[PDB]
Amino acid sequence: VAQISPQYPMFTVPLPIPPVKQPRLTVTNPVNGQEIWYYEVEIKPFTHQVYPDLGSADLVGYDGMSPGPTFQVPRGVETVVRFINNAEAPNSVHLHGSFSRAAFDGWAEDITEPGSFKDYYYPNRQSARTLWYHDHAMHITAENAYRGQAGLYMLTDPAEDALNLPSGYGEFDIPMILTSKQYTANGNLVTTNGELNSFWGDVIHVNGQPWPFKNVEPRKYRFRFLDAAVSRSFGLYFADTDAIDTRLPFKVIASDSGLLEHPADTSLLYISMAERYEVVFDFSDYAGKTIELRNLGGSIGGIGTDTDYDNTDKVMRFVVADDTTQPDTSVVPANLRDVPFPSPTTNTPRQFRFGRTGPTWTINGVAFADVQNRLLANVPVGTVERWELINAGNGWTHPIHIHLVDFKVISRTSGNNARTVMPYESGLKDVVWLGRRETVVVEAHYAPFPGVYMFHCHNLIHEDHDMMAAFNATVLPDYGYNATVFVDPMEELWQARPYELGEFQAQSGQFSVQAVTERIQTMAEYRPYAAADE
Ligand SMILES: *[C@@H]1O[C@H](CO)[C@@H](O[C@@H]2O[C@H](CO)[C@@H](O[C@@H]3O[C@H](CO[C@H]4O[C@H](CO)[C@@H](O)[C@H](O)[C@@H]4O)[C@@H](O)[C@H](O[C@H]4O[C@H](CO)[C@@H](O)[C@H](O)[C@@H]4O)[C@@H]3O)[C@H](O)[C@H]2NC(C)=O)[C@H](O)[C@H]1NC(C)=O
Ligand SMILES: *[C@@H]1O[C@H](CO)[C@@H](O[C@@H]2O[C@H](CO)[C@@H](O[C@@H]3O[C@H](CO)[C@@H](O)[C@H](O)[C@@H]3O)[C@H](O)[C@H]2NC(C)=O)[C@H](O)[C@H]1NC(C)=O
Ligand SMILES: [Cl-]
Ligand SMILES: [Cu+2]
Ligand SMILES: [Cu+2]
Ligand SMILES: [Cu+2]
Ligand SMILES: [Cu+2]
Ligand code: NA
Ligand code: NA
Ligand code: NA
Ligand code: NA
Ligand code: NA
């Protein structure tokens, strides 16, 4: 249907690459002698000329950019991020794909108001994967993410570097953060505030930039795909501008939780809100050609209900040079890793129905705000459980995200006979798309930390009002590991704290080297992640 947003100079701006986020300093952990990387991120408003000939867009973003700066953290190193709210609305940051403790996981009610900050303590022990950090505050997640609070967080492993995949952030390892938004006639953003069904958007962005291009060499590149849209699911494929309907083959090497066992040969990649898929595409056969990254119409080939606009078929253009400056020395191994699948269970699965109770998106008839009823499962730490995630509807789709765990996709049924499990769903994931009349069974090890965590639809509109619930990963009184201060997300010890803007800008008071050091060392003494020492 007709584009609403003003006309855009398609494919004339280079793909922006988000700068790497650098820690301010390191703090010696008095428990294990090791350095903790400490960072400071300031949430704050800014403007961006999106359309060159019109007014500007009002955004609010981590370090006043969008997308957020990219974190690059090696397994083994613990990090503390101080997220400082200097905006006009509260925040709650969730590091998606990290088994953070409940109070550092971005619980929706665990907000930081403007004029406050919170110290997030992260383990970085899991399999190398593409995480992302984004807002998760109650009722306002959609608008906070839409206005720029999402960013990449790369967890790296020397062991994976030996696979010799295309490499170098910004070089031959390119982030591909997808979003879909709408613009007023003067090039400002059309707000999500008030939308209750779904906010599709008619302008496709990669890394913050509408319909860009990138000059690439005829060799192999690693693409880290993130669907950071509020509501738009994609069906991604590559095509020569000479043969715009003819899909070029590629390899999917990683899902949400890391590498697959083996590259999945693919020419169409379904990707819904909050899914990460890492792709290697070889441009060597297309020297001198232009390859368009494109999006499937017909509501993602009838899997979805998403509205399609004039140019939502288009994502970006790669302009391929005649030669490489240097030889492509990278490979894509047949065998990537041994995926740590959970031990199968024959325990009878729990059922969760993603539907509508009146005007409200619900889980098993319950809305997240209904505190009395929103705790839908107690699961003893260490248990494997199967959860049957059921979309009965033909008029909505739901990418379901379960915090804490990595899970395996066991099965998919479709009431429209559309599909079952995809080859790129062969690995470990933390989000799964319930397409039209789809029911999916997933299997997860509820481990290794006790605490109350969220699960929900990752359609941010549906998520806000109000398709979100909670599980408690429980332990018995004899357990230890300081679990008493770490199962309640609202725990006082970990709550946001006020700051004066002058302290922060001068790096004094609470922000002195000495005070940061006192704070981190104290946090580290509680030993948040001891139970995952092997
Ligand atoms: C998510 O799941 C977690 C478990 O992983 C739940 O947390 C547990 O909740 C129970 C109930 O609150 C806790 O048990 C209670 O402990 C409290 C204090 O215990 C300590 O201090 C007392 C003195 O005050 C000592 O005697 C004791 O040994 C401990 O050192 C008390 O409030 C409770 O005592 C009363 O209830 C029991 C129940 O039978 C009686 O036996 C007692 O005599 C007494 O009448 C109780 O023992 C447990 O400690 C919690 N665990 C952790 C790790 O925090 C979460 O509550 C759950 N969350 C949600 C939202 O459901
Ligand atoms: C659970 O968390 C608590 C609280 O942080 C841990 O107890 C604390 O352990 C640290 C050691 O890491 C103690 O440090 C102490 O410093 C003082 C100097 O003032 C010194 O006198 C002591 O010899 C020691 O080095 C700290 O006192 C202690 N805090 C309390 C309140 O006991 C505890 O280890 C954690 N338990 C687990 C299993 O993780
Ligand atoms: Cl750039
Ligand atoms: Cu998320
Ligand atoms: Cu998450
Ligand atoms: Cu949904
Ligand atoms: Cu979440
Ligand atoms: Na920065
Ligand atoms: Na401000
Ligand atoms: Na070739
Ligand atoms: Na886990
Ligand atoms: Na302490």
Author numbering: 1 to 534
Sentences from the paper on this structure:
MCOs are capable of oxidizing various organic and/or inorganic substrates and reducing oxygen to water without release of reactive oxygen species. MvBOx, composed of 534 amino acid residues, consists of three cupredoxin-like domains with four copper ions forming two active sites. T1Cu is connected with the trinuclear cluster (TNC), composed of one type II (T2Cu) and two type III (T3Cu) copper ions, via a conserved His–Cys–His motif (serving as electron transfer path).
Here we present the first complex of MvBOx with a product, ferricyanide ion ([Fe(CN)6]3−), binding close to the T1Cu site, together with the structure-function analysis of the protein layer between the T1Cu site and the identified substrate binding site containing a natural post-transitional modification, the covalent crosslink between T1Cu-bound His398 and Trp39640. The shortest distance observed between ferricyanide and T1Cu is 11.4 Å. Therefore, we refer to this site as oxidation site 1 (OS1). The coordination of T1Cu in WT:FECN differs in two features when compared to those of MCOs without the Trp–His adduct (e.g. CotA42). The first difference lies in the fact that T1Cu is no longer in the imidazole plane of coordinating His398, but the histidine side chain is tilted by about 15–20°.
